[PDB]
Design a binder for these strands. Structure first.
Ligand SMILES: Nc1nc2c(ncn2[C@H]2C[C@H](O)[C@@H](COP(=O)(O)OP(=O)(O)OP(=O)(O)O)O2)c(=O)[nH]1
Ligand SMILES: [Mn+2]
Ligand SMILES: [Mn+2]
Length: 174
DNA sequence: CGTTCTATGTGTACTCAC
DNA sequence: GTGAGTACA
DNA sequence: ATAGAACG
């Protein structure tokens, strides 16, 4: 059980204090690559976890980022962890809260921000409407017949447009 | 023929068996 | 190592 | 979004 007001605050603590351990060397993830997503990006009044998105700049780093995740000074358990999804139950001023971390390559930034803000039913109703047209939309790309179709694309709003859906700010998405 | 309702996707990390 | 089958998005 | 079905 978690409300937006400190959900905002928890993410503020972390914007500066996420890092991983790359073959002995700690490396800090900088906020120009931390994105809030999920119900927090959609400004839901009440949350039941925080979903952060971590953008790694080169592929060779994916294997090491999340399995070796380190947040400065706060205890947490990993329930699950791989190289593109990890889940952490963290201690917030004597409160236990669920933290889901994901990772996207730069090449995936909009596709991944889209997919990971949601809401769920939004996603089910766009991945459907695009399959009809012999496409498939997932976390990583827009694919027609197992080949990525190139889109001169950078942010979310251009992707939502260039595939043919009305763009609504996170809060008003469904 | 219009109004209303309904349904619809996809991938990751995990776990036991052969 | 593969991989069906599951928890959980 | 969109299309198929029940409804009138
Ligand atoms: N819940 C859910 N999320 C999914 C699913 N598939 C993809 N997603 C994406 C969209 C969600 O924004 C994101 C996971 O978000 P969460 O499951 O934590 O819920 P959300 O953040 O949207 O609201 P919440 O965390 O429940 O307060 O993953 C799915 O099948 N179920
Ligand atoms: Mn969430
Ligand atoms: Mn989550």
């Amino acid at each position: 059980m978690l409300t937006l007001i400190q959900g905002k605050k928890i993410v503020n603590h972390l914007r500066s204090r996420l890092a991983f351990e790359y073959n002995g060397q700690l490396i800090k993830i900088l906020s120009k690559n931390i994105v809030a997503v999920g119900s927090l990006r959609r400004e839901e009044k009440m949350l039941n976890d925080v979903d952060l998105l971590i953008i790694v700049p080169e592929k060779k780093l994916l294997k090491h980022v999340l399995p070796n995740i380190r947040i400065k000074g706060l205890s947490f358990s990993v329930k699950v962890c791989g190289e593109r999804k990890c889940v952490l139950f963290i201690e917030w001023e004597k409160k236990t809260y669920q933290l889901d971390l994901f990772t996207a390559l730069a090449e995936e930034k909009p596709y991944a921000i889209f997919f990971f803000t949601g809401p769920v039913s939004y996603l089910i109703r766009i991945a459907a409407a695009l399959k009809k047209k012999n496409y498939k939309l997932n976390q990583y790309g827009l694919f027609k017949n197992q080949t990525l179709v190139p889109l001169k694309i950078t942010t979310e709003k251009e992707l939502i447009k260039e595939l043919g859906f009305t763009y609504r700010i996170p809060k008003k998405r469904l």
